[PDB]
Amino acid sequence: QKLQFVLRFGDFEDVISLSKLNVNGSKTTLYSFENRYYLYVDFCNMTDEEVENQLSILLEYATESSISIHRLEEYGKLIISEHALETIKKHFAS
Amino acid sequence: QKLQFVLRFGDFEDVISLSKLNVNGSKTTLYSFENRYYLYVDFCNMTDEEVENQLSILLEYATESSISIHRLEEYGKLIISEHALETIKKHFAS
Amino acid sequence: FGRFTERAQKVLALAQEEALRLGHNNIGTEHILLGLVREGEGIAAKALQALGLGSEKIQKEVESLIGRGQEMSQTIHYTPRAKKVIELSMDEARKLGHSYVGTEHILLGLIREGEGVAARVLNNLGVSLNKARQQVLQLLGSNETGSSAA
Amino acid sequence: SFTTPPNLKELEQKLDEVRKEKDAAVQSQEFEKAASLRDTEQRLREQVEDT
């Protein structure tokens, strides 16, 4: 099963709320695409149980994007390059 | 795959544009039909692959006429018999 | 024409690049095809490159046409073939859910235009017209954006 | 009574202008330039609702 997941965040304020929560060894990339911010968590490796696990918390603020990751990566826009969770807490707090 | 194709030109100046290159290996005869010039390339001394090749160029300036070949050959009006392409460049460009 | 994403417009203008560079005085569909594969990371570009048709493979056939060429390139404009292919991409983007039409649709548009210059280029370089459109198709659609849920 | 509670509709207007600055900043990164814009945003946000 998937070990890198593509998540959609709603309005940016949802992302702030989120920002104050988790990364957990996930380089992660944050796209902007039709007003909503997608967050692509890319777990370097996790087991399926473990990835579904981690992915739970993220998906308290996100939903799991139906937009295949190369669709985001192409016609989207970078917000944070591959350390997005870590970075968004900076870049959305203090 | 047939070694002879019938391609259709819009305004005469389009035919002229084609005329400025290639007639080699193509005996070719240029018909007149509804102010479009149909151009019959008749690849003589070619193989199927070679015809698909050549035919590219022709249909770069044209589109591929849907006229049944004995319909063209009959109810058309010759503009140039002989090597039509060689001739169009003379008779329209200089 | 009149609406188009960069990627579409870009493959089209890249055809004009081929106009003088290959000397195709007016640029056929082959140059549009070349355009797709020569922008590299367009969904069309990528698609042809999947099937194995890199910029090279296409351009080799293309060079076997007018081949650099009438570099004067009299009327360095589109052809009725290429203008149709562009129009076809528009329909191939209506089809694929892109209002401002992208690269992909143009490769799709080639397929559509299967007696066209691109198409014959592709039929000389092997690659079946529907496998080529296939590759593009499978990199579009299946989305939900402007939203996160409902 | 509630013909706009403290007229902090003006608050909301600011909170918007922020969102933009903030938003656009997060996209460029503009790390601390999104950060502080964010902070100015949620600062505002709560401020609206209380008044």
mmCIF file with all atom_site columns, C-alpha atoms in Angstrom, chain B residues 6-80:
data_model
loop_
_atom_site.group_PDB
_atom_site.id
_atom_site.type_symbol
_atom_site.label_atom_id
_atom_site.label_alt_id
_atom_site.label_comp_id
_atom_site.label_asym_id
_atom_site.label_entity_id
_atom_site.label_seq_id
_atom_site.pdbx_PDB_ins_code
_atom_site.Cartn_x
_atom_site.Cartn_y
_atom_site.Cartn_z
_atom_site.occupancy
_atom_site.B_iso_or_equiv
_atom_site.pdbx_formal_charge
_atom_site.auth_seq_id
_atom_site.auth_comp_id
_atom_site.auth_asym_id
_atom_site.auth_atom_id
_atom_site.pdbx_PDB_model_num
ATOM 1  C CA . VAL B 1 6  ? -4.518  12.976 -52.739 1.00 0.00 ? 6  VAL B CA 1
ATOM 2  C CA . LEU B 1 7  ? -4.078  16.104 -50.645 1.00 0.00 ? 7  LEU B CA 1
ATOM 3  C CA . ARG B 1 8  ? -6.229  19.268 -50.586 1.00 0.00 ? 8  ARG B CA 1
ATOM 4  C CA . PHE B 1 9  ? -5.067  22.924 -50.525 1.00 0.00 ? 9  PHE B CA 1
ATOM 5  C CA . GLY B 1 10 ? -7.067  25.955 -49.378 1.00 0.00 ? 10 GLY B CA 1
ATOM 6  C CA . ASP B 1 11 ? -6.166  29.330 -50.950 1.00 0.00 ? 11 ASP B CA 1
ATOM 7  C CA . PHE B 1 12 ? -3.798  29.024 -53.919 1.00 0.00 ? 12 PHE B CA 1
ATOM 8  C CA . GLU B 1 13 ? -1.074  30.712 -51.853 1.00 0.00 ? 13 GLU B CA 1
ATOM 9  C CA . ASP B 1 14 ? -1.072  27.597 -49.633 1.00 0.00 ? 14 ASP B CA 1
ATOM 10 C CA . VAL B 1 15 ? -0.221  25.446 -52.726 1.00 0.00 ? 15 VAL B CA 1
ATOM 11 C CA . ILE B 1 16 ? 2.479   27.931 -53.597 1.00 0.00 ? 16 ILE B CA 1
ATOM 12 C CA . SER B 1 17 ? 3.878   27.539 -50.066 1.00 0.00 ? 17 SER B CA 1
ATOM 13 C CA . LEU B 1 18 ? 4.170   23.734 -50.647 1.00 0.00 ? 18 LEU B CA 1
ATOM 14 C CA . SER B 1 19 ? 5.468   24.374 -54.196 1.00 0.00 ? 19 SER B CA 1
ATOM 15 C CA . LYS B 1 20 ? 8.649   25.946 -52.817 1.00 0.00 ? 20 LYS B CA 1
ATOM 16 C CA . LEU B 1 21 ? 9.894   22.389 -51.887 1.00 0.00 ? 21 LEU B CA 1
ATOM 17 C CA . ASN B 1 22 ? 9.624   18.699 -52.941 1.00 0.00 ? 22 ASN B CA 1
ATOM 18 C CA . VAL B 1 23 ? 8.375   17.014 -56.108 1.00 0.00 ? 23 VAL B CA 1
ATOM 19 C CA . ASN B 1 24 ? 11.177  14.449 -56.176 1.00 0.00 ? 24 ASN B CA 1
ATOM 20 C CA . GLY B 1 25 ? 9.859   10.904 -56.454 1.00 0.00 ? 25 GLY B CA 1
ATOM 21 C CA . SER B 1 26 ? 6.393   12.319 -56.895 1.00 0.00 ? 26 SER B CA 1
ATOM 22 C CA . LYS B 1 27 ? 4.895   12.543 -60.288 1.00 0.00 ? 27 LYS B CA 1
ATOM 23 C CA . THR B 1 28 ? 2.097   14.770 -59.356 1.00 0.00 ? 28 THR B CA 1
ATOM 24 C CA . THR B 1 29 ? -0.946  16.287 -60.919 1.00 0.00 ? 29 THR B CA 1
ATOM 25 C CA . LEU B 1 30 ? -2.898  19.221 -59.580 1.00 0.00 ? 30 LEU B CA 1
ATOM 26 C CA . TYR B 1 31 ? -6.635  19.300 -59.794 1.00 0.00 ? 31 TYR B CA 1
ATOM 27 C CA . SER B 1 32 ? -9.091  22.093 -59.186 1.00 0.00 ? 32 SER B CA 1
ATOM 28 C CA . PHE B 1 33 ? -12.233 21.562 -57.086 1.00 0.00 ? 33 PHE B CA 1
ATOM 29 C CA . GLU B 1 34 ? -14.411 24.154 -55.211 1.00 0.00 ? 34 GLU B CA 1
ATOM 30 C CA . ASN B 1 35 ? -11.621 26.834 -55.288 1.00 0.00 ? 35 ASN B CA 1
ATOM 31 C CA . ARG B 1 36 ? -9.403  24.372 -53.399 1.00 0.00 ? 36 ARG B CA 1
ATOM 32 C CA . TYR B 1 37 ? -6.573  22.862 -55.370 1.00 0.00 ? 37 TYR B CA 1
ATOM 33 C CA . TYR B 1 38 ? -6.385  19.108 -54.884 1.00 0.00 ? 38 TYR B CA 1
ATOM 34 C CA . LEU B 1 39 ? -2.920  17.790 -55.486 1.00 0.00 ? 39 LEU B CA 1
ATOM 35 C CA . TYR B 1 40 ? -2.315  14.255 -56.403 1.00 0.00 ? 40 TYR B CA 1
ATOM 36 C CA . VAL B 1 41 ? 1.048   13.035 -55.421 1.00 0.00 ? 41 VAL B CA 1
ATOM 37 C CA . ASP B 1 42 ? 1.687   9.817  -57.068 1.00 0.00 ? 42 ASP B CA 1
ATOM 38 C CA . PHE B 1 43 ? 4.704   8.414  -55.543 1.00 0.00 ? 43 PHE B CA 1
ATOM 39 C CA . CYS B 1 44 ? 6.431   6.528  -58.224 1.00 0.00 ? 44 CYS B CA 1
ATOM 40 C CA . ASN B 1 45 ? 9.533   4.627  -57.295 1.00 0.00 ? 45 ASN B CA 1
ATOM 41 C CA . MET B 1 46 ? 8.734   4.495  -53.545 1.00 0.00 ? 46 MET B CA 1
ATOM 42 C CA . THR B 1 47 ? 7.879   1.906  -50.887 1.00 0.00 ? 47 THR B CA 1
ATOM 43 C CA . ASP B 1 48 ? 5.116   2.254  -48.312 1.00 0.00 ? 48 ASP B CA 1
ATOM 44 C CA . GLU B 1 49 ? 7.390   3.591  -45.518 1.00 0.00 ? 49 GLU B CA 1
ATOM 45 C CA . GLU B 1 50 ? 8.892   6.019  -48.031 1.00 0.00 ? 50 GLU B CA 1
ATOM 46 C CA . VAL B 1 51 ? 5.438   7.171  -49.029 1.00 0.00 ? 51 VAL B CA 1
ATOM 47 C CA . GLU B 1 52 ? 4.358   7.764  -45.414 1.00 0.00 ? 52 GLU B CA 1
ATOM 48 C CA . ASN B 1 53 ? 7.640   9.758  -45.131 1.00 0.00 ? 53 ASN B CA 1
ATOM 49 C CA . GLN B 1 54 ? 7.193   11.919 -48.254 1.00 0.00 ? 54 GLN B CA 1
ATOM 50 C CA . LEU B 1 55 ? 3.445   12.283 -47.683 1.00 0.00 ? 55 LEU B CA 1
ATOM 51 C CA . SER B 1 56 ? 4.172   14.015 -44.348 1.00 0.00 ? 56 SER B CA 1
ATOM 52 C CA . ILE B 1 57 ? 5.687   17.033 -46.160 1.00 0.00 ? 57 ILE B CA 1
ATOM 53 C CA . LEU B 1 58 ? 2.766   17.338 -48.610 1.00 0.00 ? 58 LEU B CA 1
ATOM 54 C CA . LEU B 1 59 ? 0.212   17.242 -45.805 1.00 0.00 ? 59 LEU B CA 1
ATOM 55 C CA . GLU B 1 60 ? 2.202   19.692 -43.845 1.00 0.00 ? 60 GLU B CA 1
ATOM 56 C CA . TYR B 1 61 ? 0.947   22.375 -46.149 1.00 0.00 ? 61 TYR B CA 1
ATOM 57 C CA . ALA B 1 62 ? -2.176  20.538 -47.090 1.00 0.00 ? 62 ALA B CA 1
ATOM 58 C CA . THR B 1 63 ? -4.731  18.315 -45.465 1.00 0.00 ? 63 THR B CA 1
ATOM 59 C CA . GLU B 1 64 ? -5.443  14.833 -46.902 1.00 0.00 ? 64 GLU B CA 1
ATOM 60 C CA . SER B 1 65 ? -8.226  14.962 -49.493 1.00 0.00 ? 65 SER B CA 1
ATOM 61 C CA . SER B 1 66 ? -11.041 12.501 -48.948 1.00 0.00 ? 66 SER B CA 1
ATOM 62 C CA . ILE B 1 67 ? -11.740 12.325 -52.661 1.00 0.00 ? 67 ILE B CA 1
ATOM 63 C CA . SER B 1 68 ? -11.934 8.835  -54.160 1.00 0.00 ? 68 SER B CA 1
ATOM 64 C CA . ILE B 1 69 ? -8.991  8.642  -56.495 1.00 0.00 ? 69 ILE B CA 1
ATOM 65 C CA . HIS B 1 70 ? -10.968 7.942  -59.689 1.00 0.00 ? 70 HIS B CA 1
ATOM 66 C CA . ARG B 1 71 ? -13.303 10.826 -58.787 1.00 0.00 ? 71 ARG B CA 1
ATOM 67 C CA . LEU B 1 72 ? -10.326 13.228 -58.483 1.00 0.00 ? 72 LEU B CA 1
ATOM 68 C CA . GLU B 1 73 ? -8.616  11.977 -61.654 1.00 0.00 ? 73 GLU B CA 1
ATOM 69 C CA . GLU B 1 74 ? -11.926 12.257 -63.563 1.00 0.00 ? 74 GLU B CA 1
ATOM 70 C CA . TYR B 1 75 ? -14.094 15.171 -62.375 1.00 0.00 ? 75 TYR B CA 1
ATOM 71 C CA . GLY B 1 76 ? -11.133 17.423 -61.420 1.00 0.00 ? 76 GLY B CA 1
ATOM 72 C CA . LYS B 1 77 ? -9.528  20.027 -63.606 1.00 0.00 ? 77 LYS B CA 1
ATOM 73 C CA . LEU B 1 78 ? -5.837  19.777 -64.358 1.00 0.00 ? 78 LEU B CA 1
ATOM 74 C CA . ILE B 1 79 ? -3.839  22.762 -63.497 1.00 0.00 ? 79 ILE B CA 1
ATOM 75 C CA . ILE B 1 80 ? -0.692  20.923 -64.013 1.00 0.00 ? 80 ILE B CA 1
#
